[PDB]
Structure 1
Amino acid sequence: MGCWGRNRGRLLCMLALTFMFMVLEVVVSRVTSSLAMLSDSFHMLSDVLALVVALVAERFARRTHATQKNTFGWIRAEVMGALVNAIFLTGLCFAILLEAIERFIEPHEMQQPLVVLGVGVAGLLVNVLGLCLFHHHREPDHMELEEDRAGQLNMRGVFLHVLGDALGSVIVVVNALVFYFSWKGCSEGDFCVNPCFPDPCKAFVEIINSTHASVYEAGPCWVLYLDPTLCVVMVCILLYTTYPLLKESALILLQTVPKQIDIRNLIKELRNVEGVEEVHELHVWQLAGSRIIATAHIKCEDPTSYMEVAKTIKDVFHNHGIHATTIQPEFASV
């Protein structure tokens, strides 16, 4: 079918890819008897939640009819969804930041750099496919622009989440490559005091058999701090790419006048219309996309000739880009 399933299909494909990646990561973790990848899958559950939130928002936005609960339809839901995703991403970012700071004080050494690297390339391929999926992020008949803008907002929130996942995958790949080529781990009997993190066994195990012996150093100190710093950078990048969307979404949900419309010129043109003596309560806001609604309380003098004045005001609003207007004539006290 093709009943406006352009965005729903992409979201469903991304959800399917995320589920396959999560299943593969869980299988790899249980094969190698590792729990870090299981925790990574439980973190990917957040991406799953973001995808299902966007899917719910799109499904509710498909219902554009004027029901009893909502008079404009559930169009803003899509916009709301984007905002939600943005805020969600922001929260995740802060969480990551917190973890990063912890990893700057009690650094953890990664285990099995080769398998972690392979999972990293798998996640990189999945996230690249995702980014390719979301590469694009009387009244006239131009609802196509409104649909494009709402879809752009929602798909852009999901794109921000996928870009965060892709940056995390790049960081994982870089960290695994560095750990495999630079860092030297210690398992049993290796003469390494671990001058890097404070070590529970590498102190007690070594001292019993390294009494003034030829002890060595575990590895480079800067390697263990590559995972936090990069993450921090990614967070910053994410925050940057998260600032517009959120803002825009918030503005759309704050009844903020769209930037393409100026109120001074609009009210000047409204007051310049013949038969109009006063304009008050001129409220202009954006429902979603190109659906801009402007309600004004026009003051007139001749009730008989109100039709021409209303037509001229509607023409002025059409010229200014507003096509869903409600004009109230407050005639003089006769």
Structure 2
Amino acid sequence: MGCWGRNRGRLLCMLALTFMFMVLEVVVSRVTSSLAMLSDSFHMLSNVLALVVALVAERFARRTHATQKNTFGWIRAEVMGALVNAIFLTGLCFAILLEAIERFIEPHEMQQPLVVLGVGVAGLLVNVLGLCLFHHHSGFDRAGQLNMRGVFLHVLGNALGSVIVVVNALVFYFSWKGCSEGDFCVNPCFPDPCKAFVEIINSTHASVYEAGPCWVLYLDPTLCVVMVCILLYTTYPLLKESALILLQTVPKQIDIRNLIKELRNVEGVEEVHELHVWQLAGSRIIATAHIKCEDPTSYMEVAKTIKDVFHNHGIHATTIQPEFA
């Protein structure tokens, strides 16, 4: 109903900020005519696409009635709306790690500090508005909470790509001697493109710049490996929980060796075969079994006891087949 809301507008104000800050990063990158922020104004186009996947899936997870197309309802839509955002992220912390290994073998000089720093700090205070509207991880059942942990990592992934930038734009502005047009800046780090044009005149004398320090150029790719080893540690408890539900694994709360034992202790029941337990979404566990009873008349209270021994483990969707003989 607002920002302080109900999982619908709170994903929707944030698409109304990423879409406007991507405008503010294109307008600045045409007025100053620098074409190196067009490679960072497409950095927040992988954060508009990853807020539509969590917004389409939230529109379908409200149809829990028995459709003719799905007999359970679309309540497992928001379990794999969080499997997609944790595979679209792991295939994005792989394109960072390959782009930040090309900068090792040939470096790249940032040209305009105090304009990059005028957008890095001005973008760090948008992605520390995502990380504060996502309470239960904003320090002031698990069906939709599992979805908005997929778009918590697409905001933690971009409030760490605006601390690499701000710690980079300060090192260049406070320590880099640079190379203006002429007067002995040889760049003995970087391969100089104007190589066959400095041979005309050894100009005046020893006017040594030598581009200042050399270790500075390898600081934007050293930090894009410490950023990658943090997201591939934080996204692994999401890629395990919401992808063992879809494989229909027995939930962690439930042990099989104390259900098949307790079904055989009920009087009248001889044995139990073909027992299945899976988890639909969150705390809705569904269980079925076969039972070979003996008396075809007393199957009115013996079903009440078997319904109870599933009731004392928290599972309610029961179905049993009395194979009479």
TM bucket by the smaller chain?
over 0.9
User: Secondary structure of the residue that 1:40 maps to in structure 2?
Assistant: coil
Give 1:38 shift: 1.7
Tell me the alpha carbon deviations over residues 233-271 of structure 1, each in whole angstroms, 9 at most, x when there is no partner: 111100001101011111111111111111111221222
Give the TM-score of the pair, scaled to structure 1: 0.91
Give 1:274 shift: 2.1
Tell me the alpha carbon deviations over residues 156-190 of structure 1, each in whole angstroms, 9 at most, x when there is no partner: 00001110111111111111111211223223114
Measured in 1, the distance between the counterparts of 2:112 and 2:26 equals 15
Give 1:4 shift: 12
User: Secondary structure of the residue that 2:162 maps to in structure 1?
Assistant: helix
Measured in 1, the distance between the counterparts of 2:280 and 2:192 equals 58
How many residues align? The count is 322
Measured in 1, the distance between the counterparts of 2:146 and 2:183 equals 55
8 Å contact kept, 1:285–1:293: yes
Measured in 2, the distance between the counterparts of 1:31 and 1:3 equals 33
Give the TM-score of the pair, scaled to structure 2: 0.93
* Residues 176 and 213 of structure 1, relative CA distance in 2, 3 Å threshold: same
Measured in 2, the distance between the counterparts of 1:266 and 1:27 equals 64
Q: Give runs of ≥4 in structure 1 deviating > 4 Å.
A: 1-5
Tell me the alpha carbon deviations over residues 60-113 of structure 1, each in whole angstroms, 9 at most, x when there is no partner: 111212211111111111110100000000000001011111111122111212
8 Å contact kept, 2:2–2:9: no
Give 1:131 shift: 0.4
Tell me the alpha carbon deviations over residues 214-234 of structure 1, each in whole angstroms, 9 at most, x when there is no partner: 332202222111111111111
8 Å contact kept, 1:194–1:202: no
Higher helix share: 1
Q: Which moved more, 1:204-213 or 1:86-95?
A: 204-213
* Residues 249 and 194 of structure 1, relative CA distance in 2, 3 Å threshold: same
Measured in 2, the distance between the counterparts of 1:236 and 1:176 equals 22
8 Å contact kept, 2:272–2:290: yes
Tell me the alpha carbon deviations over residues 186-206 of structure 1, each in whole angstroms, 9 at most, x when there is no partner: 231142211222121267347
User: Secondary structure of the residue that 2:143 maps to in structure 1?
Assistant: helix
Measured in 2, the distance between the counterparts of 1:304 and 1:195 equals 95
User: After superposition, where does 1:49-68 map in structure 2 within 5 Å?
Assistant: 49-68=49-68
8 Å contact kept, 1:192–1:202: no
User: Secondary structure of the residue that 2:207 maps to in structure 1?
Assistant: coil
* Residues 33 and 316 of structure 1, relative CA distance in 2, 3 Å threshold: same
* Residues 309 and 184 of structure 1, relative CA distance in 2, 3 Å threshold: farther
Measured in 1, the distance between the counterparts of 2:278 and 2:102 equals 44
Give 1:279 shift: 1.7
User: Secondary structure of the residue that 1:280 maps to in structure 2?
Assistant: strand
Partner of 1:154: 147
Measured in 1, the distance between the counterparts of 2:178 and 2:199 equals 15
Measured in 2, the distance between the counterparts of 1:236 and 1:82 equals 20
- Which structure carries more relative contact order (alpha carbon 8 Å, separation 6+)? 1
Measured in 2, the distance between the counterparts of 1:266 and 1:319 equals 10
Measured in 1, the distance between the counterparts of 2:267 and 2:315 equals 20
User: Secondary structure of the residue that 1:129 maps to in structure 2?
Assistant: helix
Measured in 1, the distance between the counterparts of 2:181 and 2:26 equals 28
Tell me the alpha carbon deviations over residues 9-54 of structure 1, each in whole angstroms, 9 at most, x when there is no partner: 1110111111121111111111211222222122211110000010
Measured in 1, the distance between the counterparts of 2:267 and 2:200 equals 97
User: Secondary structure of the residue that 1:208 maps to in structure 2?
Assistant: coil
Measured in 1, the distance between the counterparts of 2:175 and 2:19 equals 33
8 Å contact kept, 1:193–1:203: no
- Aligned-pair identity (%): 99
* Residues 18 and 203 of structure 1, relative CA distance in 2, 3 Å threshold: farther
* Residues 306 and 191 of structure 1, relative CA distance in 2, 3 Å threshold: farther
Q: Which structure 1 residue ranges, 5 or more long, are not aligned?
A: 138-147
Give 1:5 shift: 6.3
* Residues 207 and 321 of structure 1, relative CA distance in 2, 3 Å threshold: farther
User: Secondary structure of the residue that 1:326 maps to in structure 2?
Assistant: strand
8 Å contact kept, 1:193–1:202: no
8 Å contact kept, 1:293–1:325: yes
User: Secondary structure of the residue that 1:293 maps to in structure 2?
Assistant: strand
Measured in 2, the distance between the counterparts of 1:262 and 1:4 equals 39
User: After superposition, where does 1:317-328 map in structure 2 within 5 Å?
Assistant: 317-328=310-321
User: After superposition, where does 1:18-37 map in structure 2 within 5 Å?
Assistant: 18-37=18-37
